[PDB]
């Protein structure tokens, strides 16, 4: 599912 951040929604 990753180490990402931002962009949901």
């Amino acid at each position: 599912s990753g180490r990402g951040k931002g962009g949901k929604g």
Partner: antibody
Amino acid sequence: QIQLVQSGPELKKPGETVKISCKASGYTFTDYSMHWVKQAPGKGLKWMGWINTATGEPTYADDFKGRFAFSLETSASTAYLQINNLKNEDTATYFCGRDYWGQGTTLTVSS
Amino acid sequence: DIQMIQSPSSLSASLGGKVTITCKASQDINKYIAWFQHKPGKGPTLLIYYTSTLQPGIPSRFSGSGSGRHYSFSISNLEPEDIATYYCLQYDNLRTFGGGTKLEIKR
């Protein structure tokens, strides 16, 4: 609407175990990692680690290696935080999330 | 393994004004910093990620800039609902929150 709903407030004695739930809706649970964050009374946010919601593999910050366990129930889109052998100093509000966040679960550990 | 020094720890500013918060990382974090708003009784709200990108639904009066070890975050046109504690978060190598900035509106 993206929503994370955490279980209600907890009152425990030192040495007991607690398991807090974080139920996701409005987005695909297994497409985003779930992070856990601690806020002790009067203190700032402290990152505890994350769980990969596609594999179940947890990663813990150093201060949360040992008594802390992240787990999943993928079929219920629910992430869990279990704390074993509770300590007074685990008294805090715990948040799950990544971009969006649960409302917090307040834990009080007292004898 | 990355320390984040957030400044100032608290501030007051007038309605309609603009404030800037800074965070200094102990090593280059490659623009992987985010900024959060946090109000008592609620979960944190993500405002800015990858240094300057706005979360969907967040007004453009929130902004961020930076590179290397030095990052900044601004709120312009301050309004009463901006009362909160703001945090930076590096996510280049594990995650680390800054110590927070408590914002007071000077009415």
